[PDB]
Amino acid sequence: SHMEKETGPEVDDSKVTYDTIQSKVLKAVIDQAFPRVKEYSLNGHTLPGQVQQFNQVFINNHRITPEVTYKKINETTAEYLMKLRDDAHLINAEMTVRLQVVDNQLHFDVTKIVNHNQVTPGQKIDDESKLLSSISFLGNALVSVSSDQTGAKFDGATMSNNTHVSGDDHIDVTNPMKDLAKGYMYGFVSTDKLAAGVWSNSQNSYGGGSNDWTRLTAYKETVGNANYVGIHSSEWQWEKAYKGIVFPEYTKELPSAKVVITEDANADKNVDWQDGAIAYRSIMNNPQGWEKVKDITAYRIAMNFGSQAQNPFLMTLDGIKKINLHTDGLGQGVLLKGYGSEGHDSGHLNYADIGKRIGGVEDFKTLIEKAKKYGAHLGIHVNASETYPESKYFNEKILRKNPDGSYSYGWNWLDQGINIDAAYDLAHGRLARWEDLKKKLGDGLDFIYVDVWGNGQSGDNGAWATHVLAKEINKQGWRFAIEWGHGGEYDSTFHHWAADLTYGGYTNKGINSAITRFIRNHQKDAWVGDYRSYGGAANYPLLGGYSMKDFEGWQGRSDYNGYVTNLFAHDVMTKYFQHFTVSKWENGTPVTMTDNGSTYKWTPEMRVELVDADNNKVVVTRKSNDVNSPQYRERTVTLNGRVIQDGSAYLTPWNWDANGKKLSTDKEKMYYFNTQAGATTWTLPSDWAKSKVYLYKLTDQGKTEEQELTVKDGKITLDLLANQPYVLYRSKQTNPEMSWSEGMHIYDQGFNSGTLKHWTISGDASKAEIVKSQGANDMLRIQGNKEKVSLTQKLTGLKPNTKYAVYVGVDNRSNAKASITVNTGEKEVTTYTNKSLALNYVKAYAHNTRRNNATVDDTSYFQNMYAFFTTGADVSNVTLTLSREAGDEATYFDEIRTFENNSSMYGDKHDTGKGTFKQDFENVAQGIFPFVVGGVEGVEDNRTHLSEKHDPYTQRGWNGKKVDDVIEGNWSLKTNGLVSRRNLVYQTIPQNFRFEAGKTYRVTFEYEAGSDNTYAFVVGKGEFQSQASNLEMHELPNTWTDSKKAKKATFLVTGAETGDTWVGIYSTGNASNTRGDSGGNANFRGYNDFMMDNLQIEEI
Ligand SMILES: [Ca+2]
Ligand SMILES: [Ca+2]
Ligand SMILES: [Ca+2]
Ligand SMILES: [Ca+2]
Ligand SMILES: [Mn+2]
């Protein structure tokens, strides 16, 4: 009141004809001349709409006075025909606005739009001003509040992803007050009697950051002696075009907005934004798939990359079973990053190209269907921003070009990507790409994760473009997910950088807004989770917040144990709260924090209450407001006044199956988890109190160590291991049959079942054990055997007369022969290894040589050992045998994968056998056989993979490309950019191809090399060391300056008597020659690359 009171034009609506539309509880007085609400009335209390007439709209940004005719449709409903004509700006249109009261809601709908100009979605338009592209009712508040009203206040949320900075504004409406003209995602006005919330489908943006997702605009308007704060819908979009081409019809969404009016809705006897937020759930858009979120407790990524097939579709079902047992049936969400093409960041845009080397559409369909019973939902990683020449959808027309006409290059890794123009893509059939995937896959896939979208790589990725993209995905029945905490606010249900707490640091997490989280906490994982070092909202949020970890290869992640502990430490309780809707949010006093380079104030939530449809009430209370107290980072949680979490421990009722379905009373359970040692005591519900109670320790074998608990006056006391999940039931439970590895033709391919029962052991069974790697990955170990030990299992469900490959991962520390043998009943084939000599450098593979997932002695020499065979007519007697001849030291085996394969490598025949060896790379089972990737990049998503032909884009000449990606057929072996490394790129190993002692072989291949002597053919023996081991080097010349195609290389190689000779490709110390090119041009054109094809090795 110390600044000058403000004054404005008075209201004069003495000549206005008003009508009333009303439900039983809500009356709205409306102008017949224009769709303006003068005032809302509910239970004798009022809120203004737009008090000052503004009978104008903005059409394509032009102020227009519409010619309006009114009709009263019925007691609740009025229509306004609004003719829009301005010849000078080529506006000749009409729209109908319907105002309708439904219970305590007012609906504002543009129900019908007619553009009299000729516009046809999909066709060229000569003049964009002919489009009816935007409709704005800015200037007409849908609801407001006046400074003359007691308790007048506005609350609004904007996007903030910085954990120190709340996105919310709380503004008292006073005269005087600060100017206000600002976009909001959510907005409320209230008095001490009524609160109103406003929703709009407007995909307006005023800019990036807090200016985005601004579907509402709040404005201060001084009317007479009073200030009003009014909430307006932001501008709506309609007919739009790109470079003259009108977008498809589905991009037009009819404008809609809603207001909801409420008294006290949480029984705290105060009326404020929280009541408005509760009521707002009845008018708001709901991101499709949101209902599922609360029961997706175990999210993770399973990764494939670079043709390696690290995680075949049917293998992922075994990880789902492991997590099912270990969590006693918590729901799951597995994002398949690398589901398509050759893996992650291969083949982008071709969404329907399901990865062949991981089992194709047939195994993907099986994974989806069979995962349902475990409440496991599958998602896929796609890209709508960048592609590669290999992709069916790579074309000049789709590529993004800079103003100077150069390509907007993407990242160079396996291949040099080029960004696409997403607006062009939308305007030229993007939708059909999703349709093709949906048709091929059928029903059942849960979610689409669109990587990078939001970062502008493909041009406009803002609110409008994101809603269009999400609608294409939702239309196929899929749920939307994206990378950034700030992305997809309207439609996303999952944000990777909100959920993986380690990413981005404190400025780039989930949505830091009490208002937004209150409204939608239960609908998405988009929030600030607990990560103390970020401070602010991340310093122990009372609602928790998803914490994602992984164990299936994503960024080299393999920590299964840590994954499960994390689920219990953060996610069980986070997900518990998502089964309820927030009803009350109470802040404590501001505290001072110091972290991330500043001292700042933060106002922490001290209590949050939640409720469900059955009026269960959950109360979550922070144990101290003192930021220096250990109790600041602790909560008490009650359900109906019963303590279920207190500090370090919880004993939490879980009444839902893996898919969220309510459990029968007798299947109800409770989870216990305590991050500290110590006895804890819990009050049970009376219907548990008079029952026997049974406790189980949860492990990767499911429920173990059954104990009957002693109940005393309805209490139990639990004194158990810290950081260890348990589950409690009212009756004795059993572990069901998991059918490990169903569809993979063998039982329990990964040694997860805790026994070798399905194997027939010939020899001393005490010498064969399932043991844990340094990464807790179970493996078969055979050691210390004086006689042969063999393990045999039938291969089941094979097709007759069909060609197959089978491999087992093998790491042999013994010199003794370790073998895989298949007997089809007509033929026996066998492959073996003596001591393993090649470390494993595949980052997304579970048994790479990184120390934390090493086999033993801090190393892993795991490599896939293959046999190739063909079934005959009878498939009832096909056996696989793993054996180890006598030796002291250990052989490790894991992951037996049998799958169709059509290679013809052995004297032009499929089956393992003698004859000239040939690799044309046209029928590779997986990886780069007979080579394995070397240590040139250490453990990495290796820059060598099988290159796929897409003429002319992948071949010499396209954008000045010097060398072909593919030499002959559809596939070659490509190494991208690994020049000047002085290290081994890849090598054969004896189990893949053996240079027999004292025999001599001719090794021939065709190759492309972009520069002279950057790569060399090498001959070695034993384990490579970069004392550098001895190598016979053959530097290779470039293949383009004096040749129109790949050159031929040929070498004589004699096998060392020790049997451990191999050959490969080595990155020399020589600098490449990029012929004056730099940047993306030099990367694209292949100066730094090496391609091989048509390998042949024959004895001479
Ligand atoms: Ca003052
Ligand atoms: Ca209230
Ligand atoms: Ca295993
Ligand atoms: Ca080929
Ligand atoms: Mn490629």
If DSSP states are collapsed to H, E and C, what string results for 732-788? CCCCCCCCCCCCCCCCCCCCCCCCCCCCEEECCHHHEEEEECCCCCEEEEECCECCC
**Cα–Cα distance for residue pair 268/1043, rounded to 1 Å:** 83
How many Cβ atoms sit within 10 Å of the Cβ of residue 58? 15
Q: What is the rounded (10 degree) CA torsion for 237, 242, 244, 250?
A: -50
User: What type of residue sits at position 407?
Assistant: Y
**Cα–Cα distance for residue pair 117/94, rounded to 1 Å:** 11
Strand order from edge to edge, sheet including 26-31? 18-22, 26-31, 37-42, 45-48
Ligand nearest to the CA of 6: 1
Domain 287-580: which topology?
Answer: TIM Barrel (3.20.20)
H or E segment to which residue 689 belongs = helix 686-689
Question: How far is the first Cα of the chain from the last one, in angstroms, to the nearest whole number?
Answer: 101
Strand order from edge to edge, sheet including 492-495? 298-303, 332-337, 376-383, 447-451, 479-482, 492-495
**Residue 1062 Cα to chain centre, angstroms:** 41
**Cα–Cα distance for residue pair 863/809, rounded to 1 Å:** 5
Topology alike, domains 581-737 and 901-1100: no
Residue 907 falls in which region: left (phi positive, over 0), alpha (psi -120 to 50) or beta:
left
**Cα–Cα distance for residue pair 30/7, rounded to 1 Å:** 26
H or E segment to which residue 519 belongs = helix 514-520
- For residue 270, report the phi and psi dihedrals to the nearest 5 degrees: -120, 145
How many Cβ atoms sit within 10 Å of the Cβ of residue 618? 21
H or E segment to which residue 1085 belongs = helix 1079-1085
Q: How far is the CA of 615 from the centre of ligand 5 (A)?
A: 55
Tokens of residue 709, six digits? 């608990």
Tokens of residue 235, six digits? 């501008």
**Cα–Cα distance for residue pair 324/700, rounded to 1 Å:** 9
Q: How far is the CA of 1 from the centre of ligand 1 (A)?
A: 3
Contact (CB, 8 A) for 693 and 711: yes
Q: How far is the CA of 796 from the centre of ligand 5 (A)?
A: 34
Which residues neighbour 269 within 8 Å (Cβ) at sequence distance 6 or greater?
Answer: none
**What is the DSSP-derived secondary structure letter of residue 1013?**
T
**Cα–Cα distance for residue pair 921/905, rounded to 1 Å:** 10
Contact (CB, 8 A) for 218 and 231: yes
Shortest CA distance to 449 belongs to which of 688, 289, 569? Answer: 289
H or E segment to which residue 714 belongs = none
Tell me the binding residues for Ca(2+).
264, 266, 268, 270, 275, 920, 922, 968, 971, 1093
**Cα–Cα distance for residue pair 705/739, rounded to 1 Å:** 23
Ligand nearest to the CA of 274: 2
**Cα–Cα distance for residue pair 979/216, rounded to 1 Å:** 54
Ligand nearest to the CA of 195: 2
Contact (CB, 8 A) for 1063 and 1055: no
Contact (CB, 8 A) for 174 and 252: no
Q: How far is the CA of 272 from the centre of ligand 2 (A)?
A: 6
Ligand nearest to the CA of 3: 1
**Cα–Cα distance for residue pair 214/210, rounded to 1 Å:** 8
**What is the DSSP-derived secondary structure letter of residue 479?**
E
Whose structure tokens read 């049974």? 694
**Cα–Cα distance for residue pair 773/766, rounded to 1 Å:** 19
How many Cβ atoms sit within 10 Å of the Cβ of residue 230? 28
How many Cβ atoms sit within 10 Å of the Cβ of residue 516? 25
User: What type of residue sits at position 248?
Assistant: P
Contact (CB, 8 A) for 485 and 504: yes
Q: How far is the CA of 189 from the centre of ligand 1 (A)?
A: 21
Ligand nearest to the CA of 2: 1
How many residues does this entry show for the chain? 1100
Angle between helix axes 313-327 and 360-371 (nearest 10 degrees) is 10
The angle subtended at Cα 620 by Cα 615 and Cα 622, nearest 5°, is 165
Q: How far is the CA of 1042 from the centre of ligand 4 (A)?
A: 22
Q: What are the DSSP calls for 326-354, one per residue?
A: HHTS--EEEEEET-BTTSTTSSTT-TT-B
Catalytic residues: 451, 483
Contact (CB, 8 A) for 839 and 853: no
**Cα–Cα distance for residue pair 604/624, rounded to 1 Å:** 10
Tell me the binding residues for substrate.
345
**Secondary-structure class of domain 581-737 per CATH:** mainly beta
Pairing mode, if any, of strands 447-451 and 479-482? parallel
Q: How far is the CA of 46 from the centre of ligand 2 (A)?
A: 17
H or E segment to which residue 500 belongs = none
Q: How far is the CA of 612 from the centre of ligand 2 (A)?
A: 17
Pairing mode, if any, of strands 236-237 and 134-136? antiparallel
**Cα–Cα distance for residue pair 254/250, rounded to 1 Å:** 10
Which residues neighbour 349 within 8 Å (Cβ) at sequence distance 6 or greater?
Answer: 383, 384, 387, 391, 392, 393, 394, 398, 420, 433
Quickly list H helices, 135-239.
Answer: none
How many Cβ atoms sit within 10 Å of the Cβ of residue 380? 24
Give SS3 for 220. strand
Quickly list H helices, 217-299.
Answer: 273-280, 290-293
Give SS3 for 1074. coil
DSSP E strands, 503-634? 581-587, 591-595, 598-602, 605-611, 617-622
Contact (CB, 8 A) for 1018 and 1064: yes
Contact (CB, 8 A) for 510 and 495: yes
Q: How far is the CA of 279 from the centre of ligand 2 (A)?
A: 11
Shortest CA distance to 1064 belongs to which of 965, 969, 963, 928? Answer: 928
Whose structure tokens read 């450098």? 841
Which residues neighbour 614 within 8 Å (Cβ) at sequence distance 6 or greater?
Answer: none
CB-based burial label for 220 (10 Å; 0-12, 13-18, 19+) = buried
Q: How far is the CA of 173 from the centre of ligand 1 (A)?
A: 13
Strand order from edge to edge, sheet including 409-412? 386-387, 416-419, 409-412
**Cα–Cα distance for residue pair 858/20, rounded to 1 Å:** 79
**What is the DSSP-derived secondary structure letter of residue 951?**
T
**What is the DSSP-derived secondary structure letter of residue 251?**
G
- For residue 958, report the phi and psi dihedrals to the nearest 5 degrees: -75, 125
Shortest CA distance to 866 belongs to which of 925, 928, 795, 945? Answer: 925
User: What type of residue sits at position 1097?
Assistant: I
Angle between helix axes 430-441 and 360-371 (nearest 10 degrees) is 70
**Cα–Cα distance for residue pair 450/344, rounded to 1 Å:** 13
Tell me the binding residues.
264, 266, 268, 270, 275, 345, 920, 922, 968, 971, 1093
**Secondary-structure class of domain 901-1100 per CATH:** mainly beta
The angle subtended at Cα 927 by Cα 925 and Cα 929, nearest 5°, is 75
Contact (CB, 8 A) for 645 and 573: yes
| CATH code at 1-286 | 2.70.98.10
**Cα–Cα distance for residue pair 539/602, rounded to 1 Å:** 10
Strand order from edge to edge, sheet including 983-988? 931-933, 983-988, 1061-1067, 1015-1021, 1032-1035
Q: What is the CA radius of gyration of the chain?
A: 33
Q: Answer whether the bond into residue 930 is a cis peptide, omega within 30°.
A: yes
Residue 39 falls in which region: left (phi positive, over 0), alpha (psi -120 to 50) or beta:
beta
Domain ranges (residues) in the chain:
1-286, 287-580, 581-737, 738-900, 901-1100
Q: What are the DSSP calls for 846-886, one per residue?
A: TT-SSGGG-SBTTB---EEEEEEEE--S--SS-EEEEEE-S
Is the sign of the CA dihedral 752, 755, 756, 758 positive or negative?
negative
Breaks (C-N over 2.5 A) in the chain follow: 1026
Contact (CB, 8 A) for 997 and 1087: no
Contact (CB, 8 A) for 348 and 383: yes
**Cα–Cα distance for residue pair 113/96, rounded to 1 Å:** 7
**What is the DSSP-derived secondary structure letter of residue 254?**
-
User: What type of residue sits at position 270?
Assistant: N
Whose structure tokens read 């026996």? 828
Tokens of residue 505, six digits? 């640091």
Tokens of residue 552, six digits? 């299936």
**Cα–Cα distance for residue pair 685/814, rounded to 1 Å:** 58
**What is the DSSP-derived secondary structure letter of residue 498?**
H
Q: How far is CA 286 from CA 73, 141, 283, 470, in A?
A: 29, 24, 9, 13
**Cα–Cα distance for residue pair 984/569, rounded to 1 Å:** 43
Contact (CB, 8 A) for 456 and 368: no
Tokens of residue 419, six digits? 């960004």
Shortest CA distance to 415 belongs to which of 946, 931, 1047? Answer: 946
Contact (CB, 8 A) for 880 and 792: yes
Q: How far is CA 88 from CA 62, 64, 92, 130, 134, in A?
A: 10, 12, 10, 11, 17
Give SS3 for 133. coil
Ligand nearest to the CA of 894: 3
**Cα–Cα distance for residue pair 366/376, rounded to 1 Å:** 13
| Domain 738-900 part of CATH 3.40.50.300 | no
Which residues neighbour 460 within 8 Å (Cβ) at sequence distance 6 or greater?
Answer: 422, 423
**Residue 661 Cα to chain centre, angstroms:** 24
**Cα–Cα distance for residue pair 232/226, rounded to 1 Å:** 18
Tokens of residue 327, six digits? 């969590």
How many Cβ atoms sit within 10 Å of the Cβ of residue 454? 24
CB-based burial label for 263 (10 Å; 0-12, 13-18, 19+) = middle
Tell me, in Å, the resolution of the deposited structure.
Answer: 1.9
Whose structure tokens read 């080097």? 1033
The angle subtended at Cα 432 by Cα 427 and Cα 434, nearest 5°, is 110
**What is the DSSP-derived secondary structure letter of residue 1079?**
H
**Cα–Cα distance for residue pair 46/26, rounded to 1 Å:** 10
**Cα–Cα distance for residue pair 161/488, rounded to 1 Å:** 13
Give SS3 for 435. helix
Binning the chain into helix, strand and coil, the percentages to the nearest 5 are 15, 35, 50
- For residue 129, report the phi and psi dihedrals to the nearest 5 degrees: -65, -15
If DSSP states are collapsed to H, E and C, what string results for 143-163? EEEECCCCCCEEEEECCCCCC
Quickly list H helices, 288-333.
Answer: 290-293, 313-327
Q: Which residues of 819-845 are buried (b: 16+ CB within 10 A; e: fewer)?
A: bbbbbbeeeebebbbbbbbbbbbbbbb
CB-based burial label for 1043 (10 Å; 0-12, 13-18, 19+) = exposed
Q: Answer whether the bond into residue 176 is a cis peptide, omega within 30°.
A: yes
Is the sign of the CA dihedral 55, 57, 63, 68 positive or negative?
negative
How many Cβ atoms sit within 10 Å of the Cβ of residue 553? 27
**Cα–Cα distance for residue pair 276/94, rounded to 1 Å:** 34
Whose structure tokens read 């709380």? 170
Angle between helix axes 430-441 and 463-475 (nearest 10 degrees) is 30
**Cα–Cα distance for residue pair 1022/1030, rounded to 1 Å:** 10
